[PDB]
């Protein structure tokens, strides 16, 4: 647990780490610790995938079994049946700095909704018209990736919340 929680570098949204597999409460207070199926209190009395990435504070509520939104239906879709936990905590003195952090991008446009537990590290230009945009992201043709820079001036709902979904 020490390798994936305290890691200095967290991957972006669309290309998230999948690390195969102490105590977890020895960190910053958690924005959301809502396990599904298994309960957090009976967890310690009880194949573990540890997928970690970063989310804007508005969109943390989109990581839940079976609901749509923005990044949920394009970047990281949980399956309808889920047995894991989601652990989201504050990270404002590490991943946010003045001028912005243009590292933690996210994929915004896709052809359609993706299968559960899938990532796609691609950048080919989305076509939003009828003219085939082979390599020109001009008008009515937009780049998929988009980065939301993190500033300390920004409010609570825009800070980078480092998250991990400990899917049992």
């Amino acid at each position: 647990f020490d390798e994936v929680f305290n890691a200095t570098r967290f991957a972006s949204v669309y290309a998230w780490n999948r690390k195969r597999i102490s105590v977890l409460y020895n960190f910053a207070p958690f924005f959301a610790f809502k396990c599904y199926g298994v309960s957090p209190t009976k967890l310690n009395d009880l194949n573990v995938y540890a997928d970690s990435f970063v989310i804007r504070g508005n969109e943390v509520s989109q990581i839940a079994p079976g609901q749509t939104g923005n990044i949920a239906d394009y970047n990281y879709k949980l399956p309808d049946d889920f047995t894991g936990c989601v652990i989201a905590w504050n990270s404002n003195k590490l991943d946010s700095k003045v001028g912005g952090n243009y590292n933690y991008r996210y994929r915004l446009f896709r052809k359609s909704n993706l299968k559960p537990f899938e990532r796609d590290i691609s950048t080919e230009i989305y076509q939003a018209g009828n003219k085939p945009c082979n390599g020109v992201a001009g008008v009515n043709c937009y780049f998929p990736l988009q980065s939301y820079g993190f500033r300390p001036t920004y409010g609570v709902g825009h800070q980078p919340y480092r998250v991990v979904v400990l899917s049992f």
Partner: antibody
Framework: VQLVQSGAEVKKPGASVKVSCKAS????????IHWVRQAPGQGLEWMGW????????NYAQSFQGRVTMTRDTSITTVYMELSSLRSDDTAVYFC????????????????????WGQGALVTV | PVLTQPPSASGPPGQSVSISCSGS????????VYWYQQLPGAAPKLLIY???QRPSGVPERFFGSKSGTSASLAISGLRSEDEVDYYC???????????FGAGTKVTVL
């Protein structure tokens, strides 16, 4: 914000170049520092940046193993060296601070050099 | 795979002249292009960034835009400030480095 480069100094061929620029008046660790060179009369050319919170110094393909890049955060300056300078490298060198901070390869589309230090020309 | 642009474009004072800049697939039309204005004997500064914004202090007469694989910047009025160098800067994905234009000089007619 201000960036102050080192003075001009002539170096013989086959030697190294000690050019440095100092950052002052802003948070040092939160802004990438690129490096841009200019031959007298030609266009601009790129060198590579520094992430001043770790050791990640990406370089261009034309200067992949000919430069040495070093951060000195104890005296809030950034150093660089040239190995086996020729008459083609006689130019002026700027160091520039891009807004924001990213150290990945595929993030520089949102990177423009906002402030630029003064020039320091080096010859053959 | 480097940006190319005309060395000089001449325009009479009082109205607008355009500076063109053409790039490849991986230089223009996939990545943003930025425009740098270089005062003579000084460090170049920002002129146009992200193709429809301007930094503060720049007068609202510098209009640059891109449509396909080329970009064009239109400068209106050439009295004593636009007799400088204009550089066409954009990010190249294939060579994994910033690449720049040849250097365009603007003179009055």
């Amino acid at each position: 914000v201000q960036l102050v480069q080192s003075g001009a100094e002539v170096k013989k061929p086959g030697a190294s170049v000690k050019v440095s620029c100092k950052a002052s008046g802003y948070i040092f660790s939160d802004y990438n520092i690129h490096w841009v060179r200019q031959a007298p009369g030609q266009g601009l050319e790129w060198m590579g940046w520094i992430s001043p919170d770790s050791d990640d110094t990406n370089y261009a393909q034309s200067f992949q193993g000919r430069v040495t890049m070093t951060r000195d955060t104890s005296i809030t300056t950034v150093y660089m060296e040239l190995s086996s300078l020729r008459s083609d490298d006689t130019a002026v060198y700027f160091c520039a601070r891009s807004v924001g901070y990213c150290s990945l390869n595929s993030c520089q589309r949102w990177m423009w050099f906002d402030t630029w230090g003064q020039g320091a020309l080096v010859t053959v | 795979p480097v940006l190319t642009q005309p060395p000089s474009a001449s325009g009479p004072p009082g109205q607008s002249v355009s500076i063109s800049c053409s790039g490849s697939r991986s230089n223009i039309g996939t990545n943003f292009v930025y425009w740098y204005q270089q005062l003579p004997g000084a460090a170049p500064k920002l002129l146009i960034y992200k193709n429809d914004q301007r930094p503060s202090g720049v007068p609202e007469r510098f209009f640059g835009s891109k449509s396909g694989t080329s970009a064009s910047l239109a400068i209106s009025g050439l009295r004593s400030e636009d007799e400088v160098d204009y550089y066409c800067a954009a990010w190249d994905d294939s060579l994994s480095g910033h690449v720049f234009g040849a250097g365009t000089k603007v003179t009055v007619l």
